[PDB]
Amino acid sequence: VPLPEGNQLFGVVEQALGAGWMDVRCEDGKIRRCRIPGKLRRRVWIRVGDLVIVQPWPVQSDKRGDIVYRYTQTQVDWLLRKGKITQEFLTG
RNA sequence: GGUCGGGUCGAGCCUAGGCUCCGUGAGGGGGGAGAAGUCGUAACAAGGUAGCCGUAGGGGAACCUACGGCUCGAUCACCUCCU
Ligand SMILES: [Mg+2]
Ligand SMILES: [Mg+2]
Ligand SMILES: [Mg+2]
């Protein structure tokens, strides 16, 4: 239901680097080493290959970012019906 | 007081050599935190091959093997020496 705002955009989880760090491919072609904020790190489990909202850092907004929201399967289908996400983006 | 000659002292300046300090720096090396991406299970009980010290060789990694040593080693049988 929430949508990206400003620098926020859609991303796909690619690899888990441990220590609360993730690898996420964005919808423009940049692989970013993102950090999981503690507020949502203690509530929601996240696996490899999920759609999330990536907010770039105010400094060096090219390789580092944060993950601020994750969607569910029903939300993924709803976005697919709306026309905001495509099969190519899911499959990379 | 000017000019020339002689003797002596002399800050500074140039060249060469030798030590030493500060700023960068391609590349290499371990150390400390973090939390988990990964492969195993070396230690604590006889931890499932008792553990550890010295020296030497080998192995993805904890580690393994040989010679001499210590008890900071468990259980059973026998023997020895004491109170
Ligand atoms: Mg063991
Ligand atoms: Mg052992
Ligand atoms: Mg060997």
Swiss-Prot record:
Keyword Protein biosynthesis in annotation: yes
UniProt superkingdom: Archaea
Coiled-coil zones: none
Domain S1-like: 1-72
Covalent S-S links between cysteines: none
UniProt KW keywords: Initiation factor, Protein biosynthesis
Record GO terms (molecular function): RNA binding; translation initiation factor activity
Known role: Seems to be required for maximal rate of protein biosynthesis. Enhances ribosome dissociation into subunits and stabilizes the binding of the initiator Met-tRNA(I) to 40 S ribosomal subunits.
Family statement: Belongs to the eIF-1A family.
Stated name of the protein: Translation initiation factor 1A
Organism: Pyrococcus abyssi (strain GE5 / Orsay)
Residues of the full protein shown: 16 to 107 of 113
